[PDB]
Each structure stands twice: as C-alpha cells, then as structure tokens.
Design a protein around this ligand. Sequence first.
Ligand code: AGS
Ligand code: MG
Length: 758
Amino acid sequence: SQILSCRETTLSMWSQRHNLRAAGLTSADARLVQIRGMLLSSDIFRFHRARQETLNLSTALSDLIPSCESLGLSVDAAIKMEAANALWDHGEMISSIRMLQAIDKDSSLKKQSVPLSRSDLLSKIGYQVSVARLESPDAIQKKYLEPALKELKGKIEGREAGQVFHQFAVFCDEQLQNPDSLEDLARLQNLKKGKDEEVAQLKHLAKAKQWQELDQQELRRVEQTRSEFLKLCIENYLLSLAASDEHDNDALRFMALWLEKSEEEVANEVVKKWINKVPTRKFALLMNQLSSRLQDHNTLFQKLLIDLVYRICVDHPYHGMYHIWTGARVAVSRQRATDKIAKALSKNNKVSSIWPAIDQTSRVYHALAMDRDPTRYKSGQKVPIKNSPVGQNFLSTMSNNPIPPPTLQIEVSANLDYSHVPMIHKFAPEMAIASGVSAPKILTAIGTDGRKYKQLVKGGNDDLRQDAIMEQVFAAVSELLKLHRETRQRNLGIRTYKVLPLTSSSGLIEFVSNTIPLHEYLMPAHERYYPKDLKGSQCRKEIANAQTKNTETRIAVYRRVTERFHPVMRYFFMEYFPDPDEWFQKRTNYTRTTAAISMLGHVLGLGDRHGHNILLDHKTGEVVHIDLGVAFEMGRVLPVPELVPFRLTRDIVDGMGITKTEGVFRRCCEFTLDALREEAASIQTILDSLRHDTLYQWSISPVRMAKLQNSEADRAIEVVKKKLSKTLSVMATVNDLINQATSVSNLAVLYSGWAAYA
Ligand SMILES: Nc1ncnc2c1ncn2[C@@H]1O[C@H](COP(=O)(O)OP(=O)(O)OP(O)(O)=S)[C@@H](O)[C@H]1O
Ligand SMILES: [Mg+2]
C-alpha cells in the first residue's frame, strides 16, 4: 500500500508539472501513463481485498475523464469498467451490470486508447448476469456468450479466447448438472414409463396413444437440448485447454465429463475432432486415471484413449512409461491394451533409448525388492549390495542403463526437453535394512549432479497404489490452497513425496532427505529429559492390557499413565536450532504445517496417523506425513476404531510453546478450513476424477486391516461434501475439532499402537 500510494502521487505530479518533463513527451503521454499505472494498482488492490482503496482509485480515475477528453484521449471505457468493478466488489450487483451494459451499448471500443475488447466485455456481462440470476439461462447464451464467441472472429489462441471458451464451457456444464432440469427429465421419464405401462395394460386406446406420443415428443425435445449442451461443453473445454494456461484444471473436469459419456457417440465424435490440439502436458498428471480405463475393444472411445496415452508417453516419457510398464508386466483386456502400447513404444524414434532402459531397470528393481533372505538380510544391519547374485545383477544392469532416479519428482516441461534431468551415476556400496518380515532395503544413488537420492525398495504384499493415488489427491488439494490470499501469504501447504508402484507387490518410495520419525525422536527424548518417568514401552503395555475393559477403567488407566509421562517435544527445536532467530522461524514452520495437514486430513478423513507416519524435517522444522492410504474414514471401521479427527496429542501440542493452541495453530486451522470450503467445487472435481478410477478401492481390505492392528464412492464423497458445508462458522467448526482431538475420553480409547499417551 505504501509503495503504490507513493507511485500514484509520483505519476500525478509528473503529469501536472509540464516544465520538468523532457522535450518530446506531450501531456497526452503523461496522462495516458498515469491512467495505466492507476489501473494496474487497481488490479493489485483488488486481490488484497482492500475495498476502500479500489473505491479511492476508481473515484480519482473517474475525475480524470473531463481533462482526458480535452487532451484527445479516449479512456472512458476502461475507467467506467474500473468503476463497475468497484461496484461489483462492494456488493452492488445490479448497478455493476447496468454500468457494463451502458459501456457496451454507447461506446466505441475500437477507436480508443487503453484498449478494451468487446468479447471480454460481453463475457464479463454474461458472467455477472448469470451470478445474479438477472436473466434466464436461455437469454444469457443468446445475448452474451454466443456474441462473444462471434466477436473472437475465428481467433482460437491467446488469453482472450481462453477466457471466452472457459466461460462458455462452464456455462454449458452448469446447465447440464442442473437440479431443476434433472428433476424435469426424471418427471418426463416417469410419465413415459407410466403411460407405456397403461397402454400395455389396454393392449380410449386412441387418446391414450396420442398422449403417449405427445410425451415422446416432449422427451425428445428435452434430450436434444441436453445433447447440444454436452457437445458445446466438451468442445469448449478442449478449446480452452488448447488456448491458454490460465485454466488447467479444465483437464480434470473434461476427463471426468468424457469418461462418464464413453458410450454416447456424440461425445466421442466431438472429442475425436478436437483432441489433437491440446498439449499433452495438460494430461500428463492424469495417467493413473487414463491407464486404468485402457481396454482392447475396437470402439471409438478406446481408439481415442489409446492414442492419447501413447502421445503422452512419447512426449513426456518419465511421466507415462512407468504406468505402461506396470500395466503390461476386465484386467486381462487392460493388460492386453497396455501390452500393445508398450510394443508400439519400443518401435518409434523419439522414445527408443528410454523404453528399454526403464524396462531393464524396473526388472532389476523388482527382482531386488522381492529377494528376502533372513540370513543375508538382518533387520538393522548395513549390508554391501554386492554379495547376493541379485545385488550384482542389479548393480551391473544399472551401470549399463542410465535413467533418472525413479523416485525423483520431475516437473513437466512445456518445451519437451528432459535433458537437464540428473541420471543415476552410481550407487553407494552399502544398503541399510529395516525391521520387518520382507526386509525393506534403503538404497542410495549418487546422481550425475552429485546429489544423493535415497530410496525404499519395498517388497511384500502391500498396496502402494492406494498410497500413490492419495498422495496425488493431497498434492492437488494443497495446490488449490495457493489461490487464496490468506493461505498463500503463509505458504500453507503440505510436503509431498513420491511413491512409484512397480507391481502389485513392490514399489519404490522416496526416502525423505533429512527427516527423523516422530516416534524415534520422542521415545529416547522422554527418558533423556525425565529419567523418573515411565518408559514408552511401559506406557504402551499398560494401555494395551486394559484394552478389553469398560470405558471407565480405560480412561482411569490412561490418566494414571499420562500423569507419569510428560511431553518433551519443545526440545526438538532447542537442540537442533539454538539461534533464537532460526528457532522462532522453524517453530512457526512446524505449527503451520501441522495446522494445514490437520485440516486437510480432517476434510479427507485421513487416518493411521501414528508416530511412524509423521516425519520431522530437522532442517526446515516442518512435518511430513507419509503412508496416506487409509483415507475417507476407513479408520473408524477397524477393530479398535480411530475416533479422532487428527493427531493432536500432548507432544504435538507441546511443540508449539507457551500458547498451546490459541495462536498460530488455531488461526492457521481457520484460514485453511476457510479456503477449503471455498474450493468445494474443485475438491468435488478431484474426487470425481477419483470416482472413475476402476482400481481404487473405497474400503480397506482385511489384509491391510489385519496388518494395521495386530455406493462406497458416493457415501465417501458425500461425507467429504458435508464436511465442507458453510452451515457452521469456521471458528465454531475448528473449536469443535480441537475439542474432540484433545479430549481425554477420546484419546483414552484409541489403539495402543496409536501412541496417544505420547
Ligand atoms: N518414505 C519414507 N521416507 C522416510 N522415512 C520413511 C519413509 N517410509 C518410512 N520411513 C521411516 O522408516 C521406517 C520404515 O518403516 P516401515 O518399517 O517400512 O513401516 P512401519 O510404519 O515402520 O511399520 P508399522 O506397520 O507402521 S509398525 C520407519 O521408522 C518410518 O518412520
Ligand atoms: Mg509406514
């Protein structure tokens, strides 16, 4: 605000003082520059939601119009549009709409400086008239949207056309999923059904048949209207994706809309016509959903889907070829189709030194994962990977085939240039081993640029596709958080990692760089700082013995245990960051990331939040949540249910200081939850894309349910949708959540492996 106000003063004074200016700078030039600087400041003030400053600016701009018309400037349209924006942002919807319509009626948008295209004005009026319900959705399309598409004049590239096409596509989509129109279609369908049943009962007949035919004609009209809307929706989504990059979650919405209509040949003809102009970098992150619908059926849907998956794997190989490999090496048809795509991939010129590399490398990674020997691999040791035959074959094969580390997160390149990606140079000679049955081994790889990429080569009978899908969903929602001022100002978001499933029994997990598990810090620290307290194992055993007793005894035992167990988390920051400046910044990072993941894991039902799934990053302070596969409330179905919204035990809360909760954690919870329920449409779109994934399981299979404690899509998405309801205020919702997350009667009846005493 300070810089922008001083800039306003500067530009106005320079425009007034004619003798200070140079020779060839007339007063029209100074005036025009002043106006442009003011309009820029108005954009900036609008995002900050500073109402009074946009009001001041638009008033001071409207006062310049008389003195601008005498200098020979035509800046009335841009300034009146700024006034209309101020009105709309103060709540005057009808006044803003009337002002924009007056701009459109009597103004020459062609011959005037500070240009203003007629199609963006028309689409602005159309958007505002739709929001205010000021006209029927059949006149909005006839007066504002189709005239806008006609004003583009065949230009199908740029941000102007991107805005127009996204406007029109969202309008048509909104017309399809309309509760009134769906009720009307259902009513006409029941009428047709009942009248046909009555006619069958009879075979009076003449009039009955005539009424039946009139019903049929009405139903044909309604269905044809819906078919036109579907055509326009799909076509304009595809044209908006091909024009600009402003709207790129239109790829997720187009994909959901197209997978719902895989049989309606109308949709497939429109897609066939327009699909080849979208850059494949828009679909690159949707390969879990695309490669799950592959089949060999010779239809048109499959001939489009297979070609799209092929082009994605050719342009961005490190984003599609592992999906193809996993798919090759209704399940039989999917495997056959993925095998055909793989055979075609190992035939073309662009990707031919890349597909064999990934082939051989994945084979040896899987072989190394599956190889368990209790003698050759002792849990906790550190074995040089040259003594097993699998180890030597692995090292040789990896030396002969250079690839980027499979757990490195590669960003998608618009220029299609993946040469700047570090390849695996060599492997560290040894590999660690963790405790389990099928020994998870932690490899290290030294890359070309000289960094160390550690990896968990996880083998056994686990399902990493759940964890990978949920990591992708959480990353998408955290990306939604960046669009709002309050959460973006605080960098509220989650830390991601990379899961890569190789087969149905093995995967590569990214070993997060310099973290430490929460339980592995907390259990030694508890006895280092309080040598007279109970041990972690004594508390766990004491709580597990009273697991088959009444709630009164369980709560009494829990109080007795936590009276002899004091939190020590506040020391994690006093012993990794002794400098007060750094200590304060890192403790704030911890609090903010804990708040963001608490709200985000309440909204998505995230469970299984024990100490071994939470990592503490001792370089930046901020927590990382891994193992995100038990989501959508699957955790309160277990034998000993997890009935808390998130993990907020005494140690998580002790890491926050004098102000236990009231402070940074509560304000950040409220900003997160306030930004989440203003993106409920986008979260619905993400979960809808999840709904068309044939391989995602919406219930926890008794295998993992036994590994954890020693329509389902419709119910889950409905629960998510009612957690984002604006009925209660954010303050009251967060108060309730923090009351039930820290309650002793809730924490006392949790499973003993969920270390709640801690
Ligand atoms: N991707 C990862 N990055 C960094 N550390 C990890 C990662 N995955 C697991 N860890 C940690 O390294 C160890 C590996 O844990 P695992 O033995 O694979 O599974 P686990 O969670 O320990 O077993 P349970 O069922 O939870 S008792 C644990 O101490 C984890 O905290
Ligand atoms: Mg784990």
